[PDB]
Enzyme design. Structure first.
Site, PDB file in Angstrom:
ATOM      1  N   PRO A 295       1.138   3.628  16.547  1.00  0.00           N
ATOM      2  CA  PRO A 295       1.760   4.174  17.769  1.00  0.00           C
ATOM      3  C   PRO A 295       2.928   5.135  17.543  1.00  0.00           C
ATOM      4  CG  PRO A 295       2.576   1.951  17.366  1.00  0.00           C
ATOM      5  CD  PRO A 295       1.442   2.192  16.372  1.00  0.00           C
ATOM      6  N   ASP A 296       3.371   5.298  16.298  1.00  0.00           N
ATOM      7  CA  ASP A 296       4.457   6.212  16.005  1.00  0.00           C
ATOM      8  C   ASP A 296       3.948   7.528  15.424  1.00  0.00           C
ATOM      9  OD1 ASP A 296       7.807   5.238  14.887  1.00  0.00           O
ATOM     10  OD2 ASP A 296       7.096   7.087  15.842  1.00  0.00           O
TER      11      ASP A 296
ATOM     12  N   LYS B 269      -2.722   6.051  -4.316  1.00  0.00           N
ATOM     13  CA  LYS B 269      -3.804   6.926  -3.901  1.00  0.00           C
ATOM     14  C   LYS B 269      -3.601   8.294  -4.535  1.00  0.00           C
ATOM     15  CE  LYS B 269      -3.579   4.726   0.729  1.00  0.00           C
ATOM     16  NZ  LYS B 269      -2.099   4.618   0.820  1.00  0.00           N
TER      17      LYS B 269
ATOM     18  N   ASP C 153       0.831  -1.202   0.000  1.00  0.00           N
ATOM     19  CA  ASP C 153       0.000   0.000   0.000  1.00  0.00           C
ATOM     20  C   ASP C 153       0.861   1.245   0.000  1.00  0.00           C
ATOM     21  OD1 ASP C 153      -2.809   1.299   0.507  1.00  0.00           O
ATOM     22  OD2 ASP C 153      -1.435   2.174   2.008  1.00  0.00           O
TER      23      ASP C 153
ATOM     24  N   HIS D  62      -7.619   9.249  -2.046  1.00  0.00           N
ATOM     25  CA  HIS D  62      -7.023   9.269  -0.689  1.00  0.00           C
ATOM     26  C   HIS D  62      -7.937   9.880   0.383  1.00  0.00           C
ATOM     27  CE1 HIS D  62      -2.744   9.095   1.203  1.00  0.00           C
ATOM     28  NE2 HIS D  62      -3.644   8.977   2.165  1.00  0.00           N
TER      29      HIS D  62
ATOM     30  N   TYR E  27       3.172  10.092   0.392  1.00  0.00           N
ATOM     31  CA  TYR E  27       4.216   9.560   1.290  1.00  0.00           C
ATOM     32  C   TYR E  27       5.593   9.926   0.773  1.00  0.00           C
ATOM     33  CZ  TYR E  27       0.327   6.488   2.643  1.00  0.00           C
ATOM     34  OH  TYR E  27      -0.911   6.005   3.019  1.00  0.00           O
TER      35      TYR E  27
HETATM   36  N1  LIG Z   1      -5.669   5.986   3.523  1.00  0.00           N
HETATM   37  C1  LIG Z   1      -5.338   6.717   4.600  1.00  0.00           C
HETATM   38  O1  LIG Z   1      -5.842   7.792   4.873  1.00  0.00           O
HETATM   39  C2  LIG Z   1      -4.309   6.158   5.530  1.00  0.00           C
HETATM   40  C3  LIG Z   1      -4.158   6.664   6.813  1.00  0.00           C
HETATM   41  C4  LIG Z   1      -3.215   6.107   7.675  1.00  0.00           C
HETATM   42  C5  LIG Z   1      -2.446   5.021   7.240  1.00  0.00           C
HETATM   43  N2  LIG Z   1      -2.521   4.544   5.901  1.00  0.00           N
HETATM   44  C6  LIG Z   1      -2.033   3.191   5.533  1.00  0.00           C
HETATM   45  O2  LIG Z   1      -2.152   2.247   6.612  1.00  0.00           O
HETATM   46  C7  LIG Z   1      -0.845   1.757   6.942  1.00  0.00           C
HETATM   47  C8  LIG Z   1      -0.766   1.238   8.387  1.00  0.00           C
HETATM   48  O3  LIG Z   1      -1.218   2.195   9.331  1.00  0.00           O
HETATM   49  P1  LIG Z   1      -0.176   3.146  10.116  1.00  0.00           P
HETATM   50  O4  LIG Z   1       1.146   3.194   9.381  1.00  0.00           O
HETATM   51  O5  LIG Z   1      -0.900   4.440  10.393  1.00  0.00           O
HETATM   52  O6  LIG Z   1       0.146   2.463  11.544  1.00  0.00           O
HETATM   53  P2  LIG Z   1       0.070   0.918  11.976  1.00  0.00           P
HETATM   54  O7  LIG Z   1       0.388  -0.019  10.836  1.00  0.00           O
HETATM   55  O8  LIG Z   1      -1.154   0.702  12.820  1.00  0.00           O
HETATM   56  O9  LIG Z   1       1.348   0.940  12.939  1.00  0.00           O
HETATM   57  C9  LIG Z   1       2.630   1.323  12.435  1.00  0.00           C
HETATM   58  C10 LIG Z   1       3.600   1.436  13.612  1.00  0.00           C
HETATM   59  O10 LIG Z   1       3.600   0.222  14.368  1.00  0.00           O
HETATM   60  C11 LIG Z   1       4.924  -0.311  14.492  1.00  0.00           C
HETATM   61  N3  LIG Z   1       4.811  -1.789  14.361  1.00  0.00           N
HETATM   62  C12 LIG Z   1       4.575  -2.469  13.223  1.00  0.00           C
HETATM   63  N4  LIG Z   1       4.523  -3.795  13.514  1.00  0.00           N
HETATM   64  C13 LIG Z   1       4.720  -3.930  14.841  1.00  0.00           C
HETATM   65  C14 LIG Z   1       4.765  -5.024  15.686  1.00  0.00           C
HETATM   66  N5  LIG Z   1       4.600  -6.271  15.194  1.00  0.00           N
HETATM   67  N6  LIG Z   1       4.995  -4.826  17.002  1.00  0.00           N
HETATM   68  C15 LIG Z   1       5.178  -3.598  17.505  1.00  0.00           C
HETATM   69  N7  LIG Z   1       5.131  -2.518  16.706  1.00  0.00           N
HETATM   70  C16 LIG Z   1       4.906  -2.665  15.371  1.00  0.00           C
HETATM   71  C17 LIG Z   1       5.710   0.328  13.373  1.00  0.00           C
HETATM   72  O11 LIG Z   1       7.067   0.509  13.756  1.00  0.00           O
HETATM   73  P3  LIG Z   1       8.296   0.323  12.719  1.00  0.00           P
HETATM   74  O12 LIG Z   1       7.827   0.840  11.383  1.00  0.00           O
HETATM   75  O13 LIG Z   1       9.433   1.137  13.285  1.00  0.00           O
HETATM   76  O14 LIG Z   1       8.512  -1.166  12.711  1.00  0.00           O
HETATM   77  C18 LIG Z   1       5.045   1.667  13.214  1.00  0.00           C
HETATM   78  O15 LIG Z   1       5.654   2.545  14.161  1.00  0.00           O
HETATM   79  C19 LIG Z   1       0.034   2.948   6.614  1.00  0.00           C
HETATM   80  O16 LIG Z   1       1.451   2.690   6.610  1.00  0.00           O
HETATM   81  C20 LIG Z   1      -0.530   3.364   5.271  1.00  0.00           C
HETATM   82  O17 LIG Z   1       0.014   2.546   4.200  1.00  0.00           O
HETATM   83  C21 LIG Z   1      -3.554   5.076   5.100  1.00  0.00           C
HETATM   84  O1  LIG Z   2      -2.510   8.323   4.763  1.00  0.00           O
HETATM   85  C1  LIG Z   2      -1.580   7.926   5.495  1.00  0.00           C
HETATM   86  O2  LIG Z   2      -1.035   6.825   5.301  1.00  0.00           O
HETATM   87  C2  LIG Z   2      -1.087   8.765   6.657  1.00  0.00           C
HETATM   88  O3  LIG Z   2      -2.149   9.531   7.211  1.00  0.00           O
HETATM   89  C3  LIG Z   2      -1.904  10.717   7.859  1.00  0.00           C
HETATM   90  C4  LIG Z   2      -0.597  11.197   8.007  1.00  0.00           C
HETATM   91  C5  LIG Z   2      -0.348  12.405   8.664  1.00  0.00           C
HETATM   92 CL1  LIG Z   2       1.323  13.050   8.871  1.00  0.00          CL
HETATM   93  C6  LIG Z   2      -1.414  13.133   9.175  1.00  0.00           C
HETATM   94  C7  LIG Z   2      -2.711  12.657   9.023  1.00  0.00           C
HETATM   95  C8  LIG Z   2      -2.959  11.448   8.378  1.00  0.00           C
HETATM   96  C9  LIG Z   2      -4.403  11.053   8.275  1.00  0.00           C
HETATM   97  O4  LIG Z   2      -5.079  11.250   9.266  1.00  0.00           O
HETATM   98  N1  LIG Z   2      -4.946  10.539   7.163  1.00  0.00           N
HETATM   99  C10 LIG Z   2      -6.350  10.212   6.965  1.00  0.00           C
HETATM  100  C11 LIG Z   2      -6.825  11.645   6.840  1.00  0.00           C
HETATM  101  C12 LIG Z   2      -6.456  12.377   5.719  1.00  0.00           C
HETATM  102 BR1  LIG Z   2      -5.478  11.557   4.323  1.00  0.00          BR
HETATM  103  C13 LIG Z   2      -6.840  13.706   5.605  1.00  0.00           C
HETATM  104 BR2  LIG Z   2      -6.375  14.746   4.108  1.00  0.00          BR
HETATM  105  C14 LIG Z   2      -7.566  14.328   6.591  1.00  0.00           C
HETATM  106 BR3  LIG Z   2      -8.035  16.159   6.409  1.00  0.00          BR
HETATM  107  C15 LIG Z   2      -7.913  13.623   7.720  1.00  0.00           C
HETATM  108 BR4  LIG Z   2      -8.920  14.469   9.085  1.00  0.00          BR
HETATM  109  C16 LIG Z   2      -7.544  12.291   7.843  1.00  0.00           C
HETATM  110 BR5  LIG Z   2      -8.109  11.395   9.397  1.00  0.00          BR
END
Ligand SMILES: NC(=O)c1ccc[n+]([C@@H]2O[C@H](COP(=O)([O-])OP(=O)(O)OC[C@H]3O[C@@H](n4cnc5c(N)ncnc54)[C@H](OP(=O)(O)O)[C@@H]3O)[C@@H](O)[C@H]2O)c1
Ligand SMILES: O=C(O)COc1cc(Cl)ccc1C(=O)NCc1c(Br)c(Br)c(Br)c(Br)c1Br
Length: 316
Positions: free
Chosen positions: A216-217, A78, A44, A111, A49
């Site tokens: 969590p990051d 996206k 993804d 997105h 990004y």
């Molecule tokens: N469409 C959107 O609006 C949107 C919004 C948010 C996210 N995204 C997509 O969703 C993906 C995942 O969500 P996210 O990145 O927000 O966070 P997440 O996957 O819920 O968590 C990522 C964090 O968790 C840590 N982690 C990963 N596996 C772990 C494990 N097994 N044990 C402990 N910690 C672990 C990672 O650390 P390390 O990387 O240091 O290992 C990173 O800091 C994104 O990367 C992105 O591709 C899309």
């Molecule tokens: O898409 C990702 O992988 C990372 O997502 C993020 C990264 C950062 Cl630094 C800050 C915010 C997000 C995030 O909340 N994304 C979903 C999201 C977007 Br997109 C937009 Br735009 C608005 Br507005 C709102 Br509200 C929300 Br909720």
């Protein structure tokens, strides 16, 4: 490795994918390579990004070294909301595709549903930090995206962060050529999305769960913010299977037939995150996990609510 979720186009979308948001340059490449080795096939990505060019290198490295075939990969990107005007949709996508070094995308998502001021300032905002709208809408974007599919540059279209009203808006557009194959939204035990998932599934739309580990990051995290990986009730269930909390939070989605995309650049975690096909959460464990819903979003702003088509005021 991974099992799949069948889309309405009958394409097979691997149920665990690799997240790449905030995966740094000089680590995202190794992250992708390790993941493909560990059996990931779904990656993804997003324009915003700004690491797709490094993701591209890794994908090309592994196809050229016989680790995987292009057609077994499932690549998703996206379109960012500053590029909703028709000619910008094309230029953004072309940048994305060139960066990824591919001939096609498997899925291209809107997105975010709200249009932002058009152009290459990705985060247009006023002094107070509120988003600046553009006049182009996600329907304008969708139109230009449908061309990509006509030309075979994209196999399928999807949406992200859409409530059921905006999906209704999309499905009820007269003149629609294609339908969204997935709605990618935040989803985890604190934000279980029951109504949205029920809705999408009934319209032949899959759900892709983002932030499954509570992200969590995230830089805006407060120590008082709930933490899913440290949740004792989640940890209790993991211990019961001699598995990690992350593995339970990931498997939670698989059992609801929801696609899930944990992000990591750490080789051990990337491997850990896809070892979720050798245990099963029982019906009572699923019930318990579902009960944890408190409608908590790790990803929220209220910095764009003043614009039309804000997805999070609706109940679902
Ligand atoms: N469409 C959107 O609006 C949107 C919004 C948010 C996210 N995204 C997509 O969703 C993906 C995942 O969500 P996210 O990145 O927000 O966070 P997440 O996957 O819920 O968590 C990522 C964090 O968790 C840590 N982690 C990963 N596996 C772990 C494990 N097994 N044990 C402990 N910690 C672990 C990672 O650390 P390390 O990387 O240091 O290992 C990173 O800091 C994104 O990367 C992105 O591709 C899309
Ligand atoms: O898409 C990702 O992988 C990372 O997502 C993020 C990264 C950062 Cl630094 C800050 C915010 C997000 C995030 O909340 N994304 C979903 C999201 C977007 Br997109 C937009 Br735009 C608005 Br507005 C709102 Br509200 C929300 Br909720």
């Amino acid at each position: 490795m991974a099992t799949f979720v069948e889309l309405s186009t009958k394409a097979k979308m691997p149920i665990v994918g690799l997240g790449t948001w905030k995966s740094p340059l000089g680590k995202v490449k190794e992250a992708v390579k390790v993941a493909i080795d560990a059996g990931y096939r779904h990656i993804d990505c997003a324009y915003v990004y700004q690491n797709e060019h490094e993701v591209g290198e890794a994908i090309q490295e592994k196809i050229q070294e016989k680790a995987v075939k292009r057609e077994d990969l499932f690549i998703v990107s996206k379109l960012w909301p500053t590029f909703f005007e028709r000619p910008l949709v094309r230029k953004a996508f072309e940048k994305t595709l060139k960066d990824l070094k591919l001939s096609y995308l498997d899925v291209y998502l809107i997105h975010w549903p709200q249009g932002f001021k058009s152009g290459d300032d990705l985060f247009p905002r006023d002094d107070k930090g509120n988003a600046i709208g553009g006049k182009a809408t996600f329907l304008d974007a969708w139109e230009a995206m449908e061309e990509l599919v006509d030309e075979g540059l994209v196999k399928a279209l999807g949406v992200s962060n859409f409530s059921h009203f905006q999906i209704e808006k999309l499905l009820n557009k007269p003149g629609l050529k294609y339908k969204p194959v997935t709605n990618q939204v935040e989803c985890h035990p604190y934000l279980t999305q029951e109504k949205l998932i029920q809705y999408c599934h009934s319209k032949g739309i899959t759900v892709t769960a983002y932030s499954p580990l509570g992200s969590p990051d995230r830089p805006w995290a407060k120590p008082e913010d709930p933490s899913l990986l440290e949740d004792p009730k989640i940890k209790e269930i993991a211990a019961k299977h001699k598995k990690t909390a992350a593995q339970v939070l990931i498997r939670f989605h698989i059992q609801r037939n929801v696609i899930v995309i944990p992000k990591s650049v750490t080789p051990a975690r990337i491997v850990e995150n896809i070892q979720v096909f050798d245990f099963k959460l029982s019906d009572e464990e699923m019930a318990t996990i579902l009960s944890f819903n408190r409608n908590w979003r790790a990803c929220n702003l209220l910095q764009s609510s003043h614009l039309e088509d804000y997805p999070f005021n609706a109940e679902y």
